[PDB]
């Protein structure tokens, strides 16, 4: 019977009504995943064909396919050989099977990172408040050999070890690589992965509020000028005296 803390609400640049996702926090967010998060988590639904026009040019991310070459399957007489990789291929998965994860990670299977945004109360502000939170154990609580304290997590004790602090990464641009801004540019990358639709549909909801506008007081006019005969009729009853 333990209480849970709820993340507050922040002013994102894409928060409501009509405003979009700035493609620089996302351009600078794959790299924070690429050189930190990935060697454990999977992105199987997400493939390199997707990023051709959101964060990088077509050959700019093509060159990221050669960085690691995936193992292949059955070909002629010498199958199980290695291929350089091309545009179609998916985000390479770390283990042979997911059952290897309990072997090295204390019997704690890492959650997949394709829907982690939508599968949580909170959302893209629960994850952010998770990262900077890590705190001190209070007076009078025991822990396992391999557990950590966090007042946001429902069990208050999570296996994962704080993966962000000062000077972790080198941004390709030169913006100060600090914990505060690395956390924000991860909470922006994952959201766009949860939805690739978040920007196409905010534009079909504005060109539609205008077709209705033009056509929804013109049917009202026809309707009103058929019911006037019917709305202006008087009536009698003089009976025989």
């Amino acid at each position: 019977t333990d209480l849970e803390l709820h993340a507050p609400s922040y002013p994102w640049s894409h928060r409501g009504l009509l405003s979009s996702l700035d493609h620089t926090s996302i351009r600078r967010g794959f790299q924070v995943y690429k050189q930190v998060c990935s060697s454990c988590h999977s992105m199987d639904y997400v493939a390199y064909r997707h990023l051709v026009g959101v964060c990088y040019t077509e050959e700019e991310a093509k060159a990221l396919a050669e960085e690691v070459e995936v193992q292949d399957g059955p070909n002629e007489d010498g199958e199980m050989f290695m291929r350089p990789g091309k545009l179609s291929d998916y985000f390479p998965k770390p283990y042979p099977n997911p059952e290897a994860a309990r072997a090295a990670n204390n019997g704690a299977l890492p959650p997949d990172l394709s829907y982690i945004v939508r599968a949580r109360h909170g959302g893209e502000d629960y994850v952010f408040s998770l990262l900077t939170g890590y705190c001190e154990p209070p007076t009078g609580v025991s822990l396992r050999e391999g557990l950590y304290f966090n007042p946001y997590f429902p069990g208050q004790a999570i296996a994962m070890a704080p993966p962000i602090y000062n000077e972790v990464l080198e941004f390709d641009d030169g913006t100060p690589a600090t914990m505060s801004q690395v956390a924000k540019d991860v909470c922006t990358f994952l959201r766009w992965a949860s939805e690739p639709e978040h920007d196409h549909r905010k534009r079909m909801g504005l060109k539609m509020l205008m077709m209705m506008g033009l056509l929804l007081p013109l049917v009202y006019a026809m309707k009103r000028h058929k019911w006037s005969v019917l709305k202006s009729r008087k009536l009698a009853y003089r009976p025989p005296k």
Binding site: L18, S19, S20, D22, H23, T24, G53, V54, L206
Partner: protein, 62 residues
């Protein structure tokens, strides 16, 4: 008696059904190009920058 805008409007192209039907076809044709241009422009200006076009000049003509 004074010429109302609809007075000569009803005579020329509103009589039978025929010219009442031509203009309905032609009316939309001179309407979709004007309506398309003035609808996307407000989308860009409201939040320009953030989009992918307004940064890709960093990669152009070398």
């Amino acid at each position: 008696a004074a010429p109302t805008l609809t007075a000569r409007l009803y005579s020329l192209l509103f009589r039978r059904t025929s010219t009442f039907a031509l203009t309905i076809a032609v009316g939309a044709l001179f309407f979709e190009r004007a309506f398309d241009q003035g609808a996307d422009a407000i989308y860009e200006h409201i939040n320009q920058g953030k989009l992918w076009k307004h940064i890709k000049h960093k990669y152009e003509n070398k």
